[PDB]
């Protein structure tokens, strides 16, 4: 059989890799911002949980870990 | 075609086996002749060439060709006559060198026709001084209209 579908997939992948290479720095900055927003939203969800529970503050000895950071 | 190719291969194998065995002939066994090619139309055999020893090998092969054909008839019994061709690389070169030793020598741009174009230009100086294509499957036919009309 012909490889027209395979060729189209190859061209699409080549274009996508070229686009990633062209704008990898902007993509990295956007991803870092998204990770920051992710962590902030997760912390806000936990805060909402313990606020609805009635506790005036977080439980003693509890600190929300940075689960969305490479470090 | 493929059957003839297999027949050529079988003939090559049989001739090689006859050459290798000593039972066919002490002379042929001692020669240790090796075949470059075997092709059936008559059968043409081509053996690699090593002059004096080459001539001796050719003479012995020509002498023993009849016995080789007789032995092949024992096996493929209807075997056409076998022709041995000595492969002196390019045999023309060998024969030419032999004759030359025998022979006597006696005492010792732009890719265009710019001229034609220049002539044509001088001649000129002297004389001075798409659409739509309908698909084949969509063409109307009025035969049915005529048949229904009458």
């Amino acid at each position: 059989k012909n490889v027209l579908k395979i060729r189209r997939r190859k061209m699409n992948h080549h274009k996508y890799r070229k686009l990633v290479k062209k704008t990898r720095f902007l993509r990295r900055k956007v991803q870092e911002g998204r990770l920051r927003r992710k962590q902030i939203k997760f912390e806000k969800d936990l805060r909402r949980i313990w606020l609805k529970a009635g506790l005036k503050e977080a439980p003693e000895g509890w600190q929300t870990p940075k689960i969305y950071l490479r470090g | 075609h493929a059957r003839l190719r297999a027949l050529n291969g079988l003939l090559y194998k049989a001739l090689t086996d006859l050459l290798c065995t000593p039972e066919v002939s002490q002379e042929l066994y001692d020669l240790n002749v090796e075949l470059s090619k075997v092709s059936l139309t008559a059968c043409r055999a081509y053996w690699k060439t090593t002059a004096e020893q080459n001539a001796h090998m050719e003479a012995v092969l020509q002498r023993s060709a009849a016995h080789m054909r007789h032995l092949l008839m024992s096996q493929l019994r209807n075997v056409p006559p076998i022709v041995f061709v000595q492969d002196k690389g390019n045999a023309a070169l060998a024969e030419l060198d032999q004759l030359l030793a025998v022979a006597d020598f006696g005492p010792r741009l732009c890719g265009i026709d710019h001229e034609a174009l220049n002539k044509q230009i001088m001649e000129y100086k002297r004389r001075k001084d798409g659409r739509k294509r309908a698909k084949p499957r969509l063409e109307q036919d009025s035969s049915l209209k005529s048949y229904l009309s009458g």
Binding site: - | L109, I112, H114, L117, N118, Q120, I121, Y124
Partner: protein, 326 residues
């Protein structure tokens, strides 16, 4: 002012010195000649050119230097006999300098019709009328057949669409004679959709007129640049002193190919842009050259700097080859 391209490297490769014979077959503006005279004042230089204006500039330099520089008006083919009668029949030329292309004064003048930017008669003739019987580009386009014009544009012009542009030119010429350079440019533009006027881009990746290549082709065919260049190279080799320095500048692929194949003794009929695989296949098919006569000063070509490209974009494609007669 279009400064002579890589004139410093030309001076370096030639290395002018006192009491040496140097022939400039393409005097033209003379910037190379002026730099050479700046390096050495006692050098005996020959300024050969086909443009009568170039001969006038050479005579002006002769007014500056009465006999240090010697003018000469004529083509490369005539150059052999001209120099033989001049007094350099035994050759012994200490240096030879061969530029190529269009002189700055030639290109600027619209009357010569060397540029599509400025209108003028479709002359495209380096000769300024010294031989009025010499064909002009207008006569070339009006006279030559469809196949002849297509071959001219394909070979000389390195044009992909010769079969189309030649037919368009013939169709236009059948209505009116093609006597204006801008008229020819408009005709060639009409051979393609208007958006394709500047789609073709230079080696500098800068937009150029689509007709430019065509213009180039006509220029060459008007002046027989390839054949006359080959004759000039042969005459220089005949007249060059053993150990003399030959420096050439080539502004396009065809002339550079001719110069390189002459220097390396390669057959001119050999295929172009050969790869190693193609050479291996050729030799396998042939498996069943003349002795070298030059020593290359520079094995690889020398190209102008980016700054020189910005200063003189016309000289970007110039490639310099320096050798010594052996």
């Amino acid at each position: 002012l279009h400064i002579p391209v890589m004139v410093d490297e030309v001076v370096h490769c030639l290395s002018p010195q006192k009491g040496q014979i140097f022939l400039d077959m393409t005097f033209g503006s003379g910037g190379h000649t002026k730099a050479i005279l700046q390096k050495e004042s006692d050098i005996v230089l020959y300024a050969l050119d086909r443009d009568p204006t170039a001969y006038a500039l050479a005579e002006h330099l002769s007014e500056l230097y009465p006999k240090q520089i010697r003018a000469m008006l004529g083509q490369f083919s005539q150059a052999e006999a001209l120099l033989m009668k001049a007094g350099v029949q035994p050759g012994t030329f200490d240096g030879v300098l061969m530029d190529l292309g269009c002189s700055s004064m030639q290109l600027d003048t619209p009357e010569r019709g060397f540029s599509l930017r400025k209108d003028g008669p479709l002359d495209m003739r380096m000769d300024g009328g010294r031989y009025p019987d010499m064909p002009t580009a207008a006569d070339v386009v009006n006279a030559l057949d469809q196949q002849a014009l297509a071959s001219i544009l394909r070979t000389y012009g390195e044009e992909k669409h010769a079969k189309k542009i030649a037919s368009a030119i013939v169709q236009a010429r059948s209505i009116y004679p093609i006597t204006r350079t801008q008229q020819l440019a408009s005709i060639v533009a009409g051979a393609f959709p208007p958006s394709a006027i500047y789609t073709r881009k230079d080696l500098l990746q800068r937009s150029t007129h689509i007709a430019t290549k065509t213009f180039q082709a006509l220029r060459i065919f008007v002046n027989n640049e390839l054949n006359e260049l080959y004759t000039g190279l042969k005459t220089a080799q005949k007249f060059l002193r053993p150990g003399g320095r030959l420096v050439a500048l080539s502004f396009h692929s065809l002339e550079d190919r001719i110069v390189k194949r002459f220097l390396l003794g390669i057959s001119m009929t050999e295929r172009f842009n050969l790869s190693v695989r193609q050479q291996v296949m050729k030799t396998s098919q042939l498996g069943s050259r003349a002795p070298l006569m030059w020593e290359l000063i520079h094995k690889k070509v020398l190209s102008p700097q980016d700054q020189d490209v910005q200063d003189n974009p016309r000289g970007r494609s110039a490639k310099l080859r320096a050798a010594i007669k052996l």
